[PDB]
Each structure stands twice: as C-alpha cells, then as structure tokens.
Amino acid sequence: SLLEFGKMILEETGKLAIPSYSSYGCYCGWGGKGTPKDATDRCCFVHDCCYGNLPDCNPKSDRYKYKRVNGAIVCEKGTSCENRICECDKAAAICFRQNLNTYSKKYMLYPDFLCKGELKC
Numbered sequence: 001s002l003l004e005f006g007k008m009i010l011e012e013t014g015k016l017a018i019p020s021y022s023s024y025g026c027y028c029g030w031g032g033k034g035t036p037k038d039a040t041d042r043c044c045f046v047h048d049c050c051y052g053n054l055p056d057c058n059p060k061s062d063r064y065k066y067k068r069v070n071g072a073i074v075c076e077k078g079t080s081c082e083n084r085i086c087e088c089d090k091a092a093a094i095c096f097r098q099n100l101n102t103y104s105k106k107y108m109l110y111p112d113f114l115c116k117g118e119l120k121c
C-alpha cells in the first residue's frame with residue numbers, strides 16, 4: 001500500500017513521499033497521461049506500468065512487509081501479490097533516488113491538464 005511505498009521513498013530519497021512525489025510531473029500521483037516530464041516522472045510512469053500488470057492484485061491498498069539487508073531493500077516472501085507489489089515499489093523508490101540529481105522543483109504541483117495523450121507501456 002501507499003504506507004509501505006511511502007516508507008521506502010523516505011528511506012531511499014530522504015524526502016517525505018508526500019508531497020515530494022505525490023504531485024510531481026504527469027505520472028507521480030493519481031494521473032497517468034502524456035509524456036513524462038523527466039527521469040523522475042519516468043520512474044512513476046514505469047511504476048504505473050508495473051502496477052498495471054498486477055490485475056489480480058490491489059497495489060495501492062494491499063499491505064505487505066519488507067526489510068533491509070546490507071543497506072538494500074529486501075521484499076519479504078509473502079503472497080504472490082504482496083511480493084510483486086513490493087518489487088514494483090522497490091524499483092520505483094530506487095529509481096527516485098538514482099535520479100535525485102535532476103529532480104526539479106518546477107514539476108511539483110504540476111497541473112494534470114498539461115498532461116494529455118495515452119503513452120503505451
């Protein structure tokens with residue numbers, strides 16, 4: 001759920017998931033349209049694609065557990081859904097920190113209306 005994902009984000013980036021990544025660009029948030037604004041936005045686009053490929057699960061609401069070994073996130077082996085959701089979240093949180101050097105304040109609170117057109121995964 002957003003609880004676990006938000007925790008990963010804070011641990012990896014040092015930024016509170018909300019509002020740093022909840023209204024960023026075209027894909028970091030509820031929205032999902034247009035061309036990703038930058039690397040960080042692409043992390044969210046990919047994250048959406050990952051969630052979109054878990055039709056048999058409830059990514060935003062399903063709770064799961066994970067731990068950290070040797071400084072890296074390790075998804076606990078729970079149900080198939082919990083494991084997959086965890087992996088989608090892990091990849092995104094890491095993607096966020098790997099791209100913090102191009103994170104731009106101007107894309108925060110980005111207006112959804114500026115994002116149009118479906119972009120295939």
Ligand SMILES: COc1c(O)ccc2c1cc([N+](=O)[O-])c1c(C(=O)O)cc3c(c12)OCO3
Pocket residue numbers: 002006009017018020021022027028029030043044045047048051060
């Ligand atoms: C399905 O999509 C999304 C992504 O691809 C990437 C990130 C988020 C996302 C959807 C969220 N909501 O809203 O859907 C959400 C939320 C929220 O619930 O408040 C809070 C956050 C997020 C996201 O990142 C940091 O803090």
